[PDB]
Amino acid sequence: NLRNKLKLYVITDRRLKPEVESVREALEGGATAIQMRIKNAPTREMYEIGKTLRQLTREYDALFFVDDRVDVALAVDADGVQLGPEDMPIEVAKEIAPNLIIGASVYSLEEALEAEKKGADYLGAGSVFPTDARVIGLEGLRKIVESVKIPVVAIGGINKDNAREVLKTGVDGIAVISAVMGAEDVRKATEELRKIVEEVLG
């Protein structure tokens, strides 16, 4: 279910590659979850791209999340929304969007446990490595994993050279941006990471 489909979590970055093409390649390569993350674009544009990503993810039986924007997630029938300290409070998103899966970006053990208490469905725990400027490291990531019962996706500076050490901490998934989106060959970059995920998680 959710826990399994969070294993390889790929986030868009139009600074690096256009969303639709890059998501297609990531999905070809074995991404199990996609997050649309668009910093500054009109709502209509977010909606149109979101509709396309919702179709592609469905074609590959992948989960689809939108960063921040609950309106957009609702409008495109996304599986969920990712929420951080500058976003809609968890309890409020839950009220207005009771069927969305809520991911919470957390940067400390206190924040992890609080997000879980407020009803987050999974955590994005970071930043594991330098990339909020807070860096939790492998040690901090491991402590969050040990303390919470909801799924935990590691994030922050994760790539093929460190993915194994990250996955050894007990997380359910890794989230990547640059490692995939900034690659010369997006699909191959994703395949390399998915192999490591399969190797460590089983």
Feature table: binding site: 35-39, 67-68, 87, 105, 131, 157, 177-178
Q: How far is the CB of 44 from its own copies (least distance, A)?
A: 5
Q: Which of residues 41-70 bind its own copies (CB under 8 A)?
A: 42-45, 47, 68-70
Peptide linkage before 127 cis (omega within 30 of 0): yes
H helix intervals, 19-88? 19-28, 43-59, 70-75
132 binds, among Ni ion, its own copies, none (CB under 5 to 8 A by kind): none
Quick one: which of 157, 166, 151, 154 has its CA closest to 199? 166
Which H helix or E strand runs over 99?
A: none
- Closest C-alpha among 79, 84, 75 to residue 49: 75
Exposure string over 32-66, b if 16+ CB within 10 A, otherwise e = bbbbbbbeeeeeeebeebbeebbebbeeeebbbbb
Q: How far apart are CA 27 and CA 38, in angstroms?
A: 19
CB 10, min distance to its own copies, A: 23
**Nearer Cβ to Ni ion (58/164):** 58
> With respect to Ni ion, which residue has the nearer C-beta, 28 or 132?
28
Of the candidates 75, 113, 135, 196, which one interacts with its own copies according to CB under 8 A? 75
199 binds its own copies (CB under 8 A): no
Task: Report in angstroms how near the CB of residue 28 gets to its own copies at its nearest.
Answer: 29
User: Please, which of residues 7-46 interact with its own copies by CB under 8 A?
Assistant: 40, 42-45
Site residues (vs its own copies, CB under 8 A): 40, 42-45, 47, 68-72, 74-75, 85-89, 92-93, 95-96
